[PDB]
Amino acid sequence: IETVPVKLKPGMDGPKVKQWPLTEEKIKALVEICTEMEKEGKISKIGPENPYNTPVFAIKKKDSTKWRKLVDFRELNKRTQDFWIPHPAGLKKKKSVTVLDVGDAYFSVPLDEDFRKYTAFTIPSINNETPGIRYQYNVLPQGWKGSPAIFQSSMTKILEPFKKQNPDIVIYQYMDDLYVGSDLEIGQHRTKIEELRQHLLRWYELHPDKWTVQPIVLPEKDSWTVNDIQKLVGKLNWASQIYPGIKVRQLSKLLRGTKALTEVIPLTEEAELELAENREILKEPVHGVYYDPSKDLIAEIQKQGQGQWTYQIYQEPFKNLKTGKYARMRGAHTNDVKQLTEAVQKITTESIVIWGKTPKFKLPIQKETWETWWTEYWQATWIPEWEFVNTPPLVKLWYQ
Amino acid sequence: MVPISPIETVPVKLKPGMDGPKVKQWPLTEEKIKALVEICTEMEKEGKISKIGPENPYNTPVFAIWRKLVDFRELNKRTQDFWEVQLGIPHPAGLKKKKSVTVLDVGDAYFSVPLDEDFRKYTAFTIPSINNETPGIRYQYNVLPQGWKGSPAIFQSSMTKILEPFAAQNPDIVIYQYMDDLYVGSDLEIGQHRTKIEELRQHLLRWGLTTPDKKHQKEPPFLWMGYELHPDKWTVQPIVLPEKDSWTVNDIQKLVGKLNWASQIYPGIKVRQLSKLLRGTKALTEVIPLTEEAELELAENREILKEPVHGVYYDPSKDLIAEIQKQGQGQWTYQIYQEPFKNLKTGKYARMRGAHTNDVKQLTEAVQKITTESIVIWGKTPKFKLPIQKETWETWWTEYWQATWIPEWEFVNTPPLVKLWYQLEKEPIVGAETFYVDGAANRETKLGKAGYVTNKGRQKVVPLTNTTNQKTELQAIYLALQDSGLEVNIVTDSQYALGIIQAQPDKSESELVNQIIEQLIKKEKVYLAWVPAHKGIGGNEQVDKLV
Ligand SMILES: Cc1c(Oc2ccccc2OCCn2ccc(=O)[nH]c2=O)cc(N(C)C(=O)CCl)c2ccc(C#N)cc12
């Protein structure tokens, strides 16, 4: 009911990002949505004196046939002044966590007068026939980092009774999402979630306990071919960058001579001992692996085939903070890009739960393909940063 | 007097921290001064400008050619940024056929859009007096000056706001605004069409804007931005390839400009060689000889550009189809159409700069380009006809290390067909000879050696002059491919060679890589295994090639 002064970082102008082309159905959807929001005062039309722009597109969330408006506030977010809560380190330790969309609550708080012109966006026209419908926000926009910061006080006032009632429930907020962690039963968790949503009304099942870090495992065979031993020495040599005491000389000793790749080689006793020592070494955690809130999080994804994907979250090379394998199949059996996009969304969600921020992705895909198709399968309210790797990494099978 | 509705002014500011322009007035001849006094007197009588006192410290130079011409380049440098009037120009293939299309001249409205009061003082200009014996006449603009930075954007915005209710209450027509011209199309009867045109003239007159009752000068075929727009079709303005005995650099840039521009409707245009002659020149007047490939390419262009070809307009009720053909040397051509033999438009795609490539990657890139273009022009992705078998694409994307995807498409049998030229095995090959390869070079003398030893006792080491480590590693693999049977296992330590071959190229800049590809095509089964170097892995003999 009272606007809080918001400004930009010193020396930075507002965002001026090109609106990318949209299909006709998305344009029409945005026309209906923005017409309705204009009738509600949430947005207002602007004139040519506003040079700032932020991209916009339309999506369809899970279990819904209504379109939704997505604004790519990444540039404005990095150009918006830093607002100033320690991250709940116990949210990742909880048994279950549910994600709720509280973005509607932001639209009840007006936006600072002078700052509105930086939220400008454009509904584009087909074939550049018309100049495009230009809008700016009058309330807190969904996707902007200042919205949860400004609404944090009111959110504390709304969640104060529920927090006081259940001290065992962890509550976290990131952008337009509310993460609610507990240790109850799935039915009790769903009834409790309905309790919290009806509590918020009058004013996504996720289980981190079933997620752990993945160790480097070595094969267990009764007979090894030359090729098997070569791959094993390769994987152990790669793992020696992560683990100090990895030793491969006794296994490389067996590869002496020019033998056929399919020839079975029996292991010597020294080779068995070396392999067992390497197993014991790989069973231990990595030495000196810590998180630095001042550094970026980097996430790498490898396509393993048959709907299987691997990923690693780290900050320094060979110091993995998280590793995982997303093999879920959900209507994307014939589309690599949809699988990759869902994987990026899940990894970003896990990173939000663990560290409270999104990582920078390294995507195994050509820039043009991804930039062409990723909005088609995006269902989250946030967007991370990403870059593209054009050279096949050798370590792929070493994560398989 | 009928009350004229006021046009809302757009608030305008200068760039932050800057000040209005202050430029010395140009000295003018007596006749030019008299002409500018007459013109500015008439404009003041009409209300476009107003006299100002000496308090205004700003000034912008004025000229006459009469016709008054104010040079606002400084004020433009000091004026704020505005939202772009147009992000891009439309494409004729996106237009929808209309029974009637009328052109209205709203030029007189340009000078009828008011300027923000607080900004008018920055448009001040001075007419020098005769013999400079009196203070020059001081004027300022009250409306959008032509040549000012924000005039087109504010004009188009104001006109759009004026036309919004008329277009809303008449959905059965289409109105388009371009510069000081409106274009109104409809499928109604010609009588109803002229009626609604009169209604538009009245609605514009309710803001005091006058559309001429004179029959407009624009009439089919409409010539616009190098385009010919007809009632039922569109094309490019005539493209004439000149007959030159010798071609300079600007002749080749003009020829590649005409061919690039003509390629959007003429199918099969190629610009590879002619643009290749312009590689790394940076000399406009340099005369470059013509290669034979450029001569054959230019002859094919003259054969394609012989007779005129037209494109149709977009019919939203029919499906959108895009068909692709490979032309070789990284060249691709495509037609976008709805009915067979009647193209909406055409185009080409050239492969990107790269050391290694294959046909499937280029076809994928071209599909992405056509998809973006089609979403721009028509707002939807077309269905594709591609020269590649379904099984070929399935094998490729299932086995490719990168994620990839093309939208709905069907196979069309139009050679040359995009195919996979070789496929590496996933597991070692039983019964096949195993070639342990290696290569090495001296960084100073550039002397090296490349070779292999096999499980059957076959060996070879070749010495090489003027080579590198990477070159000797590739050369080692090549030697193993040369001397082996149809099925072969190859063991290397070269992360570089594996990085190249796992990218699956079918063509390369390096002749050595191309030779390796040619050897791979001849093979039946090839398994390529990697091992770490200098780890004592026997067979992998680093000392054999470092002698
Ligand atoms: C006649 C004209 C434009 O046409 C239309 C105008 C209004 C509705 C539909 C139209 O097009 C349908 C296809 N069509 C075209 C010609 C014809 O006779 N019959 C026919 O059905 C569109 C333009 N472009 C490209 C625009 O961006 C609109 Cl400012 C023009 C641009 C310049 C000039 C000039 N001189 C003229 C333009």
From Swiss-Prot, chain B:
Effect of L182R: 20% loss of DNA-directed DNA polymerase activity. 21% loss of RNA-directed DNA polymerase activity
Effect of Y178A: Almost complete loss of polymerase activity
Outcome of mutating G257A: Complete loss of polymerase activity. 25% loss of RNase H activity
Phenotype upon changing D105S: 5- to 12-fold decrease in affinity for dTTP substrates. Strongly decreased RNA-directed DNA polymerase activity. Slightly decreased DNA-directed DNA polymerase activity. No effect on RNase H activity
Impact upon substituting I162A: 71% loss of DNA-directed DNA polymerase activity. 61% loss of RNA-directed DNA polymerase activity
Site (Essential for RT p66/p51 heterodimerization): W396, W409
Domain RNase H type-1: 429-547
Effect annotated for changing L274S: 21% loss of polymerase activity. 16% loss of RNase H activity
Consequence recorded when altering Y178F: 70% loss of polymerase activity. No loss of polymerase activity
Effect of mutating H534 to D/N: Severely reduces exonuclease activity of RNase H. Probably also reduces substrate binding affinity. Modifies cleavage preferences of RNase H. No effect on the endonuclease activity
Effect of V437S: Slight delays in replication
Outcome recorded upon mutating M225A: No effect on RNA-dependent DNA polymerase activity. No effect on RNA 5'-end and 3'-end cleavages
Cell compartment(s), UniProt: Virion
Effect of H534D: Severely reduced exonuclease activity of RNase H, but no effect on endonucleonuclease activity
Residues bound to Mg(2+) 2: D438, E473, D493, D544
Effect in UniProt of substituting F222A: No effect on RNA-dependent DNA polymerase activity. Complete loss of RNA 5'-end cleavage. No effect on RNA 3'-end cleavage
Effect caused by changing H230A: Complete loss of RNA-dependent DNA polymerase activity. Complete loss of RNA 5'-end and 3'-end cleavages
Subunit description: Heterodimer of p66 RT and p51 RT (RT p66/p51). Heterodimerization of RT is essential for DNA polymerase activity. The overall folding of the subdomains is similar in p66 RT and p51 RT but the spatial arrangements of the subdomains are dramatically different.
Name of the molecule in the record: Reverse transcriptase/ribonuclease H
Organism: Human immunodeficiency virus type 1 group M subtype B (isolate BH10) (HIV-1)
Organism lineage: Viruses, Riboviria, Pararnavirae, Artverviricota, Revtraviricetes
Gene of this entry: gag-pol
